[PDB]
Amino acid sequence: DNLPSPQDVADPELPPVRATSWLLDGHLRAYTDDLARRLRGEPNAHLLHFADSQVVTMLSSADPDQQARAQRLLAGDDIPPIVFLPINQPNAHWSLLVVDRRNKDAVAAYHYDSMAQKDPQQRYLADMAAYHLGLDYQQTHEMPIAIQSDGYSCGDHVLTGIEVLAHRVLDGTFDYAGGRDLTDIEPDRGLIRDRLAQA
Amino acid sequence: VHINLKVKGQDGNEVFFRIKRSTQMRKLMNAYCDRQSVDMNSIAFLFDGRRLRAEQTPDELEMEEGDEIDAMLHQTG
């Protein structure tokens, strides 16, 4: 009755990742879903939360109920304290904002942008997300990350940074010297495609 | 047997749907996409942070009367 029929339009499908194709929000969530599976059961893993980039954008919605729903999904009482927020500038760029709420009275926020000459729009979008999460955007730290030499792999740098920082939380180096420094990462598009294919 | 749901797009306007709890989501996804004249491969449907698929039903998703779904344009960069 509700089954898909061959005479109608096919169900939607996320397109595959190519060698230099721009990553979509669906690709990012599939990667972080698979990462959460790989980390499940490990010590400290339950302190982490990987946000969907569409929920992050919902924080700035002009609709009251949609805005409050996003605030509950990312800062509610049941959300882990270390949240990774992908920041999207549509048709343009990806960056990463990390919010550490383990101390309710001393929240720390970190922003990673792999673009060489930075766009003022990108930090502004990161500042709006922090503002709608109840933070002072002026206290967000702009942190070092490897600079991309191409015009396509900004999504790769975001996912690799989440990958690396998550494992530093697992082994306990996130809180010590250079624990939040991502200068030496080397994103691997082939590895990213493999993890999306084996998920 | 029926359930009333809302879909809220980035225009802020809410669209009210009434389907059976056994009806798969593709019926709602198709009807919404025809109003906006964009295909289903350009819009993501999320329910409390969960991405919806064409084959899932409200009962499988544990939806309740008056629940709301967010329809968001795809993001690239």
Residue numbers in the entry:
A (entry chain A): 317 to 515
B (entry chain B): 19 to 95
Quote the original article.
CE clan proteases, specific hydrolases for ubiquitin-like modifications (SUMO and NEDD8) in eukaryotes, reportedly serve as bacterial effector proteins with deSUMOylase, deubiquitinase, or, even, acetyltransferase activities. Here, we characterize bacterial CE protease activities, revealing K63-linkage-specific deubiquitinases in human pathogens, such as Salmonella, Escherichia, and Shigella, as well as ubiquitin/ubiquitin-like cross-reactive enzymes in Chlamydia, Rickettsia, and Xanthomonas. Five crystal structures, including ubiquitin/ubiquitin-like complexes, explain substrate specificities and redefine relationships across the CE clan. A comparison to the previously determined SENP2-SUMO2 and NEDP1∼NEDD8 complexes (Reverter and Lima, 2004, Reverter et al., 2005, Shen et al., 2005) revealed differences among bacterial CE DUBs in three variable regions (VRs) near the substrate binding (S1) site that were arranged around a structurally conserved helix (constant region, CR).
To understand what structural adaptations enable XopD cross-reactivity, we determined the crystal structures of covalent XopD∼Ub (2.9 Å) and XopD∼tSUMO (2.1 Å) complexes. To our knowledge, XopD is the first cross-reactive Ub and (t)SUMO isopeptidase. Furthermore, the extended VR-1 conformation was completely different between the Ub- and tSUMO-bound complexes. While the Ub S1 site primarily consists of contacts to VR-1 and some to VR-2, tSUMO binding displays the opposite trend, with the majority of interactions taking place at VR-2. In contrast, the bulk of contacts made in the tSUMO-bound structure are through VR-2, which forms multiple ionic interactions (XopD Arg385 and Asp368 contacting tSUMO Glu86/Asp88 and Arg69, respectively) surrounding a hydrophobic interface (XopD Met374 contacting tSUMO Met90). The tSUMO A62R or R69E mutation both resulted in a decrease in tSUMO suicide probe reactivity. Surprisingly, a M90A mutation had much smaller effects, suggesting that the small hydrophobic interface may play a lesser role in tSUMO recognition than does the extensive charge complementarity. Although highly divergent in sequence, the Ub and tSUMO C termini threaded into the active site similarly, with no apparent favoritism following Ub Arg72. Additional mutations in VR-2 targeted the primary tSUMO interaction surface and resulted in either a slight loss (D368R) or a gain (R385E) in activity toward Ub substrates, while activity toward tSUMO was significantly reduced. Interestingly, our structural analysis of XopD bound to either tSUMO or Ub demonstrates that XopD’s flexibility in substrate recognition primarily arises from incorporation of an intrinsically disordered VR-1, which can be tailored to suit either binding event.
